[PDB]
Structure formats: C-alpha cells, structure tokens
C-alpha cells in the first residue's frame, strides 16, 4: 500500500479566535458588515461545555470597549463637583431642589443655577455633594446616542466554523446528538439585568436548570422559562429638561419642575402566570432533589443596590425595582406591583473609577417586556431556600451562548490507498 | 446530600511508625492539620495532591469512596489533630498519642 494526500476533509478542532460583528448606539452599529444558510450535519455527536466557552469573555470585553469608546467624545462634568444647596421638593423626600454656582462661557464670571436631583445621587457634608466627588470623575452621556439594544450577530473568520446544538433537552454539558453548522449566530440583544432576564430566548421543550456543579452552593443557578411573563414598567412623572452653558460650546442638561403631581414609578406583573411559572420551576428543581423536600423562596439577603434589586434600563432611564413580592412562597409535596427607584449617576461593569451621568428625559416613560429566565442562589447548611442573585454579567451572556462553539478546520489528511505515483 | 464518616477517632502511634486514617465522604475531600490553640493549616487540598511547603512524608490515596492519609517517619511535633472536610461540612478530627 502507498500513502496519499487529500486536501478537502471534514475535520475540526477546538481553538479560540477573534469573532467579528454582522448586523446612533452605545454599541457601535453600522460599523458592522451587513448580513442566511444553515447546514444540518447528520450522524455527528460532539461535546459542548458552556462554562468554559471563550465566546463569552470576548463579547464581555468587546461590550466594555464599545462603552468606553462611546463615552469618549462627550462632555466632562468636572465643574459640577461643587457644594450644592439642596432643599425639599413639596414618594416623599425622594427628590431634591439644589442650587449652586457654575462657570459660564466667560472665564471671569459666574452664574447661579438650580436643578432637581434624586436622593440617591447626593450625600451630606443643608450642604450636599455628588456621590462620586471622592472616588471617580463623572462624564455626561451624549443625548444623540441611544441605549436601546439592537441584535448583533457574531461571525467566524474564513477557515473557521460555528457548531450549534439543536437538542431541546440539552443541559449545560454533555454530547449533543443533533448538531448543525452556521457561520453567524442569531441576534443577541445586549440587555443588562441582575435578577430577571429580559427580552431573551425561550425554551421550546420546558423549563431548564443549569449550573456548573449543583453540589457547590457558591455557583449561581440559571432558570430558562418556556413561556414569557409580561411585565409593564412606567414612570408617571412628566419631566422638563433645561440647558446650561458651562463653557465655550459646552452644555449641561438639567431637570426643570415636574408638570402636575408627583407619583412613584413602578412595574406590574401578572399573578396567575407567575404562580404557574413558579410551580413549573419548583417541579423541575425538585427533579434534582428528593421528592420529600420542600422548596422555599425568599428575597435577596444583602449586598449592593445592584444585586438586592432588579436593575435595568427602560428607554434611556435606569430603574432599580424591588422584587420582594415575587419571591415569597413555600411549596410542599389582580396583579403584583413592584416599587422602583431611579438613579442618574451610573457606575457599571463593576469598575470603581469611571462614573457616568445620564441626561434627564422629558415625557412619560413606558416599557413592556418579557421575562425569560431567573438567576438564583441556593442556601447551604429537608428544605432548601433559593434567593435571587446577580451582579456579574457573564452569566447573562452564558444564558445566550450555550449552544454555539467555534472550531478550526484542518483539511490535510494522509490516508491509505492502493495506488502508486508513476 | 453529603454522607461523611471518620472511623479512626483515637489512635496511639509510636515515633517513626507509619499510620493511616480512613475518611469516607462524597465529593472533593481536604486533609487539614490543626495544633491545639492554633488555626488549621492546609495539608492536602484535593485528597491526593500535596501543598507547597508541606513535608514530603505526608501523602494521600483515594480508593473508591474511601480516603487515606499516610505519613512516614513521625516527628515529635507531628502529633496533633487531623480532620477531613468536604465543602461546608466537616467532622471533628482524630487526635494521636505519643
């Protein structure tokens, strides 16, 4: 027998590479190549591990880079680090009316201005100051850019393939009987949320529970719903915006008086739908534990204002809703209104050095969205208590990128055959 | 859940002899040594691996669910309490005698 050479063979290996984008905004879109064909590979089984997937870290650092790049050409609010004079506005005690001296377009003259500040944004030293005046430097977000998520497709370079798992009952790890090949993923809207996943993708078969190793209580548990749970969030206040000339060609946007009465912002969720989704979750979670065990629920134990409350962005404004009423039940074997708070000084991505100011939005803010998953923490130590937890944004992306994996294509092979070269 | 057992409660070993203590547990197992009045120190972190700076005489072997801690050339300062731990759960250790 004699060895031969084949240049086209279906062979793949595990490797990590740079994935590019295919599709103003904070995440730069229209800088992505405009965008299909999907091939089903038959009689192939491959192993997927979503807890060491590399496509999560790359997308995390890409989104961080996009945020930093988009905040660069905007106004710096360094002259706003000043001693304010705040007074009560007459949701009692939440708003403040603060007056202060500010610089003007002439270097040797000043002006006296005022603005409406939330209670969560000021601290005392009658004299108040911003929260970040001792830890961080604050920059204003440009009003042109929009915070609304837009789907982004991640595509592999030439010579590289993306394999996805089409198994409906697939958990976090293990072989996938039904495999397929694409070169660009589905639209993945970048949404930030700490306790409830919003605008996600549903499960076709049923609720699914995935953790790295469920015996370890230090690992979060990801729950994926099969039907959405509609939630309606609103800010009833009618806001008015102002402009202040703080330098040569530099404007700071302040809030004017609220037109009409002042009411609390909130969110509504349906009681029956949530009382059925909790039952399905309890059953699928009782699969792992003993049938005699009883499943409790409780609200978060403690932490930051970002992990104790469900935090999100509703049309350019930041909400921190209290979800103590959702997670209060015990299972053995009308609507729910969630009060929310609003903050303007936003420090995110778990950095302690770079703050950001969100300009006020005039009008009434309304959001209608789905709830497509939960992130929980089981307490350790015949009953189990599960409390919502979050704060790390890589779980949010693991929830979406569990199917896909990236493979090198190696097309050279030397097989035996019965022929010789003349 | 986690089922755990420590059979060699009290042991009487002489200097220079080799002894073993059996810990039965589910999951990753750690061997710790704690002198009386002092904070525990890590000896074996996975049940068969050794920690940096520990004497080479200490070693461990895992056979099925059973775990064994083996030492050779016992020293006068080598007599203390030794316990196995798994995640949050731990059982009181074994005290040897001179």
């Amino acid at each position, epitope marked *: 027998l004699w060895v031969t050479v084949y240049y086209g063979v279906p062979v793949w290996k595990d490797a990590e590479t740079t994935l590019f984008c295919a599709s103003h905004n904070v995440w730069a879109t229209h800088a992505c190549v405009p965008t299909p064909q999907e091939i089903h590979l038959e009689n192939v089984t491959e192993e997927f591990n979503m807890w060491k997937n590399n496509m999560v870290e790359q997308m995390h650092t890409d989104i961080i880079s996009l945020w930093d790049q988009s905040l660069k050409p905007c106004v710096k609010l360094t002259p706003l680090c000043v001693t304010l004079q705040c007074t009560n506005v007459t949701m009692r005690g939440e708003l403040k009316n603060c007056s202060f001296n500010m610089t003007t377009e002439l270097r040797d003259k000043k002006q006296k201005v005022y603005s409406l500040f939330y209670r969560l944004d000021v601290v005392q030293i009658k004299e108040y100051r911003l929260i970040n005046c001792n830890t961080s430097a604050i920059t204003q977000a440009c009003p042109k850019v929009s915070f609304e998520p837009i789907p982004i497709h991640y595509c592999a370079p030439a010579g590289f393939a993306i394999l996805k798992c089409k198994d409906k009952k697939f958990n976090g790890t293990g072989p996938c009987p039904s495999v397929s090949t694409v070169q660009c993923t589905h639209g993945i809207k970048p949404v930030v949320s700490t306790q409830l996943l919003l605008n996600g993708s549903l499960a076709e078969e049923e609720v699914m529970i995935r953790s790295e190793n469920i015996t370890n209580n230090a690992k979060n548990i990801l729950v994926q719903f099969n039907t959405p749970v509609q939630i309606n969030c609103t800010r009833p206040n009618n806001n008015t915006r102002k402009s202040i000339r703080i330098g040569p060609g530099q404007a700071f946007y302040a809030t004017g008086d609220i037109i009409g009465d002042i009411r609390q912002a909130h969110c509504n969720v349906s009681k029956a739908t949530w009382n059925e989704t909790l039952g399905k979750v309890v059953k699928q979670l009782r699969k792992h534990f003993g049938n005699n065990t009883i499943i409790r629920f409780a609200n978060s*134990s403690g932490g930051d204002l970002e992990v104790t409350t469900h935090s999100f962005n509703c049309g350019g404004e930041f909400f921190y809703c209290n979800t103590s009423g959702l997670f209060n039940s015990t299972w053995i074997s009308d609507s729910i209104t969630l009060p929310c708070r609003i903050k303007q000084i936003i420090n995110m991505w778990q950095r*302690i050095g770079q703050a950001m100011y969100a300009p006020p939005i005039q009008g009434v803010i309304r959001c209608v969205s789905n709830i497509t998953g939960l992130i929980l*923490t089981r307490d350790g130590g015949t009953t189990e208590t599960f409390r919502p937890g979050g704060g790390d944004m890589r779980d949010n992306w693991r929830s979406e990128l569990y199917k896909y994996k990236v493979v090198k294509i190696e097309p050279l092979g030397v097989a035996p055959t019965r022929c010789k070269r003349r | 859940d986690i089922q755990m057992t420590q059979s060699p409660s009290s042991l009487s070993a002489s200097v220079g002899d080799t002894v073993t203590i059996t810990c039965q547990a589910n999951g990753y197992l750690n061997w710790y040594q704690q002198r009386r009045g002092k904070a525990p120190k890590l000896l074996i*972190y996975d049940g068969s691996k050794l920690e940096r700076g520990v004497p080479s005489r200490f070693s461990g072997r895992r056979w099925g669910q059973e775990y064994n801690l083996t030492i050779n050339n016992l020293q006068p300062e080598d007599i203390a309490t030794y316990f196995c731990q798994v995640y*949050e759960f731990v059982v009181p250790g074994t005290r040897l005698d001179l």
Partner: nanobody
Framework: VQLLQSGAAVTKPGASVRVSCEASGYNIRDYFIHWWRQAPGQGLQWVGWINPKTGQPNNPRQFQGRVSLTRHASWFSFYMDLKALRSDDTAVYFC????????????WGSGTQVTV
C-alpha cells in the same frame, strides 16, 4: 496574602459585637472569604461566605436573621455582626480565603475568641 483579625471581646447576652478582618496582601476581588466558628473541643462549623465584588452574603438556616456580613473597600476590611447572642454562642471565629472550586482554604486569620 495575610489576614489580620481584631482582638477578643466579652459581652452580655442580647448585645452586638464586631470582629473586623482585613486583607492587604493580594488581589482581593477575585477570591471569596468564608467564616468558621468552633466550640471548645468540637469540630469547625460553617458560617457563610461574602462576595468582595458585590457584597452578597450567604448563611445557613440556623444563623440567618442574626448575622450580617459587610465589606468596606478603600481607594479591604471584612466585618461580621451578631444581633442576638445566647449562652451557647461562645466560640472562636476564623477568616478563610477560598481560592478554587475545591473549597480549599490556604490562608487563615489568627482568630477571635468571644465569650458570652
């Protein structure tokens, strides 16, 4: 990578106590910190962990409602609280530094011996 612990304290039942615990040695945000308490002549008992990045605590059913854990970053000191004490809460408390998925602790504090 060394953990400094505060001194001992004696208090009456139905009081509050604080046991500061500070880490100065390493990159602190990347590792959890656990608390253990032991009674005289008995094995260790788990009390719970705290996440340095977000401050999320975790406690067993017996201790929940009585103990709260808090951290205070500086431009890292970990605390512990006990709202309601009792005769049997006299123990010794240790800080531990988890560093892997095996829950192996390689650094411990000197310990605080609290009597009631």
């Amino acid at each position: 990578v060394q953990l400094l612990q505060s001194g001992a304290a004696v208090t009456k039942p139905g009081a509050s106590v604080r046991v500061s615990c500070e880490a100065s040695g390493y990159n602190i945000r990347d590792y959890f910190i656990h608390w253990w308490r032991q009674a005289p002549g008995q094995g260790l008992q788990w009390v719970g962990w705290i996440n340095p990045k977000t401050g999320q605590p975790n406690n067993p059913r017996q201790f929940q409602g009585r103990v709260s854990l808090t951290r205070h970053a500086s431009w890292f000191s970990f605390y512990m609280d006990l709202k309601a004490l009792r005769s049997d809460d006299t123990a010794v408390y240790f800080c531990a530094r988890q560093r892997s998925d095996y829950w192996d602790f390689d650094v411990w504090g000197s310990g605080t011996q609290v009597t009631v």
